[PDB]
Amino acid sequence: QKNIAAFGGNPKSVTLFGESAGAASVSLHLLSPGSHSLFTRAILQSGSFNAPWAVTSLYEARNRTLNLAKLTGCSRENETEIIKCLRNKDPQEILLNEAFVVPYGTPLSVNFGPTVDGDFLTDMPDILLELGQFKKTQILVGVNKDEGTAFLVYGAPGFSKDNNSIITRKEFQEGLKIFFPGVSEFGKESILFHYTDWVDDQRPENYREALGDVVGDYNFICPALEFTKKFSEWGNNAFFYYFEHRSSKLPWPEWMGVMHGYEIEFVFGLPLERRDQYTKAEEILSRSIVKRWANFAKYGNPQETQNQSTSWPVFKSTEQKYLTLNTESTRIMTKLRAQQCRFWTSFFPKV
Amino acid sequence: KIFFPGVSEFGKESILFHYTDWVDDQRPENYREALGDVVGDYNFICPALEFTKKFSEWGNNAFFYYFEHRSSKLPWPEWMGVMHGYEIEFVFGLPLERRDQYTKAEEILSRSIVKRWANFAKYGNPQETQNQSTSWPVFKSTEQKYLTLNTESTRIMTKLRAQQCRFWTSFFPKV
Amino acid sequence: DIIIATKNGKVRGMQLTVFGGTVTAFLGIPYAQPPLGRLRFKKPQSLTKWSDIWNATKYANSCCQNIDQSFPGFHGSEMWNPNTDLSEDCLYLNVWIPAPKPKNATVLIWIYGGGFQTGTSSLHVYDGKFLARVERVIVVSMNYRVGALGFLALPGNPEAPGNMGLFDQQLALQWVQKNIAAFGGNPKSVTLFGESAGAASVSLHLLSPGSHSLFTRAILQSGSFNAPWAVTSLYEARNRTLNLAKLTGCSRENETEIIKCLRNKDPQEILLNEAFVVPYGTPLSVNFGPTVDGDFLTDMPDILLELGQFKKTQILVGVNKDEGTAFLVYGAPGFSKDNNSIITRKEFQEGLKIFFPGVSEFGKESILFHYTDWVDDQRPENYREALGDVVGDYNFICPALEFTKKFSEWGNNAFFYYFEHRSSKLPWPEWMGVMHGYEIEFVFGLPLERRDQYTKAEEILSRSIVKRWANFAKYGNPQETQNQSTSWPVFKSTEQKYLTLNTESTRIMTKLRAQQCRFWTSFFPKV
Ligand SMILES: *[C@@H]1O[C@H](CO[C@H]2O[C@@H](C)[C@@H](O)[C@@H](O)[C@@H]2O)[C@@H](O[C@@H]2O[C@H](CO)[C@@H](O)[C@H](O)[C@H]2NC(C)=O)[C@H](O)[C@H]1NC(C)=O
Ligand SMILES: *[C@@H]1O[C@H](CO[C@H]2O[C@@H](C)[C@@H](O)[C@@H](O)[C@@H]2O)[C@@H](O[C@@H]2O[C@H](CO)[C@@H](O)[C@H](O)[C@H]2NC(C)=O)[C@H](O)[C@H]1NC(C)=O
Ligand SMILES: *[C@H]1O[C@H](CO[C@H]2O[C@@H](C)[C@@H](O)[C@@H](O)[C@@H]2O)[C@@H](O[C@@H]2O[C@H](CO)[C@@H](O)[C@H](O)[C@H]2NC(C)=O)[C@H](O)[C@H]1NC(C)=O
Ligand SMILES: *[C@H]1O[C@H](CO[C@H]2O[C@@H](C)[C@@H](O)[C@@H](O)[C@@H]2O)[C@@H](O[C@@H]2O[C@H](CO)[C@@H](O)[C@H](O)[C@H]2NC(C)=O)[C@H](O)[C@H]1NC(C)=O
Ligand SMILES: *[C@@H]1O[C@H](CO)[C@@H](O)[C@H](O)[C@H]1NC(C)=O
Ligand SMILES: *[C@@H]1O[C@H](CO)[C@@H](O)[C@H](O)[C@H]1NC(C)=O
Ligand SMILES: *[C@@H]1O[C@H](CO)[C@@H](O)[C@H](O)[C@H]1NC(C)=O
Ligand SMILES: *[C@@H]1O[C@H](CO)[C@@H](O)[C@H](O)[C@H]1NC(C)=O
Ligand SMILES: *[C@@H]1O[C@H](CO)[C@@H](O)[C@H](O)[C@H]1NC(C)=O
Ligand SMILES: *[C@@H]1O[C@H](CO)[C@@H](O)[C@H](O)[C@H]1NC(C)=O
Ligand SMILES: *[C@@H]1O[C@H](CO)[C@@H](O)[C@H](O)[C@H]1NC(C)=O
Ligand SMILES: [Ca+2]
Ligand SMILES: [Ca+2]
Ligand SMILES: [Ca+2]
Ligand SMILES: [Cl-]
Ligand SMILES: [Cl-]
Ligand SMILES: [Cl-]
Ligand SMILES: [Cl-]
Ligand SMILES: [Cl-]
Numbered sequence A: 001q002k003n004i005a006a007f008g009g010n011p012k013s014v015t016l017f018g019e020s021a022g023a024a025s026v027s028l029h030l031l032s033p034g035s036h037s038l039f040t041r042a043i044l045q046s047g048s049f050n051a052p053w054a055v056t057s058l059y060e061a062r063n064r065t066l067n068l069a070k071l072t073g074c075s076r077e078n079e080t081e082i083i084k085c086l087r088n089k090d091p092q093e094i095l096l097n098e099a100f101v102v103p104y105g106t107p108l109s110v111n112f113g114p115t116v117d118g119d120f121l122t123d124m125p126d127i128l129l130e131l132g133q134f135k136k137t138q139i140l141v142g143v144n145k146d147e148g149t150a151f152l153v154y155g156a157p158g159f160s161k162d163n164n165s166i167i168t169r170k171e172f173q174e175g176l177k178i179f180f181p182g183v184s185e186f187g188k189e190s191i192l193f194h195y196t197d198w199v200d201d202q203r204p205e206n207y208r209e210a211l212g213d214v215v216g217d218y219n220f221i222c223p224a225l226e227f228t229k230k231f232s233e234w235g236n237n238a239f240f241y242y243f244e245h246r247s248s249k250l251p252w253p254e255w256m257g258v259m260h261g262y263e264i265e266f267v268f269g270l271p272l273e274r275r276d277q278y279t280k281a282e283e284i285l286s287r288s289i290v291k292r293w294a295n296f297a298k299y300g301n302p303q304e305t306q307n308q309s310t311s312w313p314v315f316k317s318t319e320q321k322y323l324t325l326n327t328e329s330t331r332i333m334t335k336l337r338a339q340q341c342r343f344w345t346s347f348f349p350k351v
Numbered sequence B: 001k002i003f004f005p006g007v008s009e010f011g012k013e014s015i016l017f018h019y020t021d022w023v024d025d026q027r028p029e030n031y032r033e034a035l036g037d038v039v040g041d042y043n044f045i046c047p048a049l050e051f052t053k054k055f056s057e058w059g060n061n062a063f064f065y066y067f068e069h070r071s072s073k074l075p076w077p078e079w080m081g082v083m084h085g086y087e088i089e090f091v092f093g094l095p096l097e098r099r100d101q102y103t104k105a106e107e108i109l110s111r112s113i114v115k116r117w118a119n120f121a122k123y124g125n126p127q128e129t130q131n132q133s134t135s136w137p138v139f140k141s142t143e144q145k146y147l148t149l150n151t152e153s154t155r156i157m158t159k160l161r162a163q164q165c166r167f168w169t170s171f172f173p174k175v
Numbered sequence C: 001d002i003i004i005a006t007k008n009g010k011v012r013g014m015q016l017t018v019f020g021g022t023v024t025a026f027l028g029i030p031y032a033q034p035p036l037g038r039l040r041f042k043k044p045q046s047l048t049k050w051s052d053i054w055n056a057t058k059y060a061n062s063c064c065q066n067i068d069q070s071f072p073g074f075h076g077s078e079m080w081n082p083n084t085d086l087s088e089d090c091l092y093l094n095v096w097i098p099a100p101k102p103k104n105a106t107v108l109i110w111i112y113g114g115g116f117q118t119g120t121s122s123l124h125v126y127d128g129k130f131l132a133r134v135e136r137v138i139v140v141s142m143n144y145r146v147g148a149l150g151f152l153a154l155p156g157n158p159e160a161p162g163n164m165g166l167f168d169q170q171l172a173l174q175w176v177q178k179n180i181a182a183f184g185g186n187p188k189s190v191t192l193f194g195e196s197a198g199a200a201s202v203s204l205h206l207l208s209p210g211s212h213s214l215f216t217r218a219i220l221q222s223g224s225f226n227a228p229w230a231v232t233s234l235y236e237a238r239n240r241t242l243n244l245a246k247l248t249g250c251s252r253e254n255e256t257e258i259i260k261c262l263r264n265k266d267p268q269e270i271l272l273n274e275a276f277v278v279p280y281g282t283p284l285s286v287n288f289g290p291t292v293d294g295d296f297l298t299d300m301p302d303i304l305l306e307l308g309q310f311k312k313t314q315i316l317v318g319v320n321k322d323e324g325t326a327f328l329v330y331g332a333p334g335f336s337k338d339n340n341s342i343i344t345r346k347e348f349q350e351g352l353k354i355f356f357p358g359v360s361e362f363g364k365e366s367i368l369f370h371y372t373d374w375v376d377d378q379r380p381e382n383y384r385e386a387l388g389d390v391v392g393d394y395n396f397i398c399p400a401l402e403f404t405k406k407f408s409e410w411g412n413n414a415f416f417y418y419f420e421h422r423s424s425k426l427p428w429p430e431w432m433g434v435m436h437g438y439e440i441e442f443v444f445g446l447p448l449e450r451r452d453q454y455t456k457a458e459e460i461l462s463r464s465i466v467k468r469w470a471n472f473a474k475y476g477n478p479q480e481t482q483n484q485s486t487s488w489p490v491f492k493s494t495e496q497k498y499l500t501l502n503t504e505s506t507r508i509m510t511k512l513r514a515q516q517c518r519f520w521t522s523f524f525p526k527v
């Protein structure tokens, strides 16, 4: 705000964009009254603060601060004395102990993250979202087709980047234990139930695909769609995309599909670099995404107006139109993961 | 186990789960009341409400009532409340018989139900038009208005057992 | 040790433990010159400034008032009596703030009832510490003058212009605009709330142009200014000021000479005579209350309501299931807190005489007629229940519903509740049901105190009401969003949806007391 005019920029036309925790951050700036006047609009790539990894409760937070003290020989009496001790520790001694403040972590553990501090965040963010207490502006929100797969190779039994990861029923069950460690037996059976009614050939990859869907729907896609619904109910324009292109250069194996984080290079326009070995179709998809992001930032409308492109409709409650981003045919579709999200959003929270 | 013998372990836990989140005093009758609700919702009330929704979606007028008066003469004990089958005597007008030991309020409730059933039969509209009565609204998808039948205050209400019926009607059949 | 710098100087507070946490309480901060001597009966004058640290560590003097002596030793009446010294030196206010000091907290300002004749901010059931702890709001409450000391009127004469206690309230709201940021509060997010005459006061601030910029929204618990006890006409007002003079040996010639005489009287001599300025009073008499003064209130409030001349904002409005019963034991024949109060037809008739003394014979028969068409068993309590319904519908429920309709017709969101839970601890007997004033303890979160012998279901109902009031104040929408709760719909003309508050099943219902209110609102006024 203070300096960008000197570089030829317009402080009145600032768009935030971010991916994963970076997207959850963009979403919290839409909520924080101290950020309201520092930006114009927002773009959220695979993340939002209502994802179940994004915000730590006060209770877990103090428990984690105190466990960190026990581990560093910093358990004290005066709280300000705990911190003063902690300031004397070598940064390495703090990093080494971070993983252990939690009794069981998952590959998506966020040990130290946003909290309701009464300053940045004045109330529980789900309450602010629901009651319309956020900056009124346009948003662009999206997710990748295979969000969940990247995490399976960081602890799910029977998975591996170096084979096809065909797993059994029993391995799937063990995998729900790895990803949902605090959850009751019934809570875990209910997941198995929703995701294993096969249609239907006895395909060997049934369980492998189901486990990636479980992880992506719960952690990324359903919270993104739900954030988008509630936000657009207060009258602002929203645009939703489903990214479904697997990079020709992806070094992870094929079963992992269109992974978490692998739209970013298209957004930054790396395939525009011809001397770089992306394909021609990839250059053109990146060039269209670049123009759409740029139009959204400048004009609040992510259209590509010159090349007979598919027109991107606004996302509303009720119709829930979204746009697919791929190398062949750009399509408008409706009600992404409708059945799955009813499960995660209206049933599972009760569990 | 007695009421859902063919049902999986998970199917049965899901019932326990929906019906035992207590609100909340540790009341000793919690489980007794929950088990009667389970049996009535699954077997009678949710299928009735669901039949009424689907039928009225094709354009016809429907009227829905919730009967909540316990007969002063009921020989079953009190914990059983407003039992299955014990509206019938009000519909047939037995309490109209004064020499029969129903109360005055019961004679009047039966007399109003008799007139409503009769008007529905003759005129297709179950109103009691002469005695400043509550007007019975048609039941539609979306609003789901229904009328309560009782001895004190006749009321229009909406969305009977909404949460319970979402369970029986959209989840449980999958089990 | 907690010291805050105000515009008028430093104040010191004290810390309280509440549910394993801390709240900081500043009790007894002055907000005006003591209105003594030549200032008796005048508008509150602004306060000078102190050098040194003002100690705000105990409740202050309550204002001069007659006391309820109908049931000595009985906690049901006596919990409403003042619990600090009575004095004309009573213009003080209280502040409860969360600890650690909040950054920009919403502010809730409580205005007590008592008929404009009684009441005090220091009562136990108005202690703001529970709301500050649980909801992280700041809670403010003030004392304001009541009785003749607060509402004597010779309209247009600044020695006794009328509405002085409403001006006392107004000046405390200004104190909050100027000072609350120093305590971590947001002057841009202030909600008024009040019960009974306190609610009627909140409603008059929605009408008074001098209050428009001192608050954001309003909550009205069992009261509004269109209730028939809430506003005195100019005619009754002068008659009452002059009768008061006859009684004190102050009848004079020059009006300013009447007031000067009255300023020499002992406060007791004024209190003693207050009951007699009226030829026949009822248990709901308001001898000295709001008037159309041309200053606070620029026209008859029913005219302002009807023509849309009020602050545009959200409101939350509600009533209790048995508003009328508390008043029956203060003069209705055959009633008693110590028996079941089964009364006859003839006692009911005598009771209408006690409650509607200026009303014609036909006016009284019309009431009997609307409320005694029995349905139908010859139940012995028919007449007892009918008389409480009469008193509650006329005085509280129908004026509240009517205020809510007219207000929401000008485009603002309104929420209406019907409170139907009888406290497990109620010391009044059962036939009195869900009495007037006995939601207040749920709103202030007293049952959150486990060591206090309310039930578990009561803790949970209070916790949900607390969250709803807090959300309304912060966000203008009284939802409880986390616990699968019933969603509270806005009240509109036409549908008239309202929410029930009870321990079992929270319900949305429509058209509360439709038939009764047609009677009170469209027929009875003609009588
Ligand atoms: C895919 O590989 C996994 C991962 O573990 C292995 O990596 C392989 C490429 C292989 O070279 C192997 O030596 C290495 O350990 C296999 O899962 C393992 O299966 C064994 C049974 O031998 C289990 O006891 C192991 O605990 C399990 N390891 C882990 C870390 O879970 C997996 O079976 C294989 N799948 C195929 C080929 O379909
Ligand atoms: C309920 O009590 C009233 C109130 O008056 C009485 O309080 C009682 C508890 C009792 O001890 C009695 O001594 C005391 O006076 C009764 O009303 C009274 O009824 C009498 C007839 O005896 C009338 O002449 C009185 O004027 C009347 N008193 C008042 C102040 O109105 C009432 O009858 C009783 N009702 C019951 C038991 O159902
Ligand atoms: C927060 O509090 C305790 C902390 O216990 C932890 O001690 C830390 C220093 C760290 O090393 C961590 O791994 C360890 O768990 C949690 O209680 C644990 O759970 C077990 C259950 O078997 C208990 O026996 C112990 O109290 C403790 N474990 C061990 C091995 O000492 C507690 O669960 C946690 N609260 C949460 C997650 O809500
Ligand atoms: C206002 O004016 C007179 C005031 O009369 C009153 O004198 C006061 C000092 C006080 O003690 C009060 O009790 C007394 O009533 C009212 O007229 C009264 O009504 C009677 C009817 O029987 C008349 O005979 C008298 O003028 C007077 N009564 C007595 C006993 O002296 C008048 O009604 C009132 N106006 C209103 C209420 O609108
Ligand atoms: C603890 O010590 C700090 C810093 O040394 C001091 O300022 C504070 O007053 C003390 N607090 C408590 C709670 O003992
Ligand atoms: C539009 O088409 C031209 C060629 O016809 C091409 O060079 C370019 O990549 C396209 N522009 C955008 C923004 O997609
Ligand atoms: C209507 O009211 C009359 C008396 O006023 C009564 O006798 C009768 O029971 C009522 N009729 C019906 C149909 O309810
Ligand atoms: C206010 O409170 C403290 C007591 O803790 C005292 O030191 C101070 O002087 C008091 N002021 C008075 C009594 O005026
Ligand atoms: C508090 O919030 C308001 C808006 O409701 C804002 O204008 C104000 O300046 C804020 N003050 C702070 C954080 O001190
Ligand atoms: C009466 O006396 C007052 C005050 O002493 C004086 O100012 C005023 O002019 C007089 N008014 C009338 C109407 O006689
Ligand atoms: C919500 O539910 C929790 C327990 O599940 C309970 O402790 C609390 O009283 C509730 N919160 C509100 C605001 O009602
Ligand atoms: Ca976490
Ligand atoms: Ca006390
Ligand atoms: Ca009056
Ligand atoms: Cl199994
Ligand atoms: Cl569709
Ligand atoms: Cl509804
Ligand atoms: Cl008669
Ligand atoms: Cl209706």
Ligand SMILES: [K+]
Binding pocket: A190, A347, B014, B171
């Ligand atoms: K389920």
Ligand SMILES: [Mg+2]
Binding pocket: C080, C113, C114, C196, C437
């Ligand atoms: Mg009171």
Ligand code: NA
Binding pocket: none
């Ligand atoms: Na990772």
Ligand code: NA
Binding pocket: A247, A249, A250, A251, A265
């Ligand atoms: Na890459």
Ligand code: NA
Binding pocket: B071, B073, B074, B075, B089
């Ligand atoms: Na029978």
Ligand code: NA
Binding pocket: none
């Ligand atoms: Na009273």
Ligand code: NA
Binding pocket: C423, C425, C426, C427, C441
């Ligand atoms: Na009480």
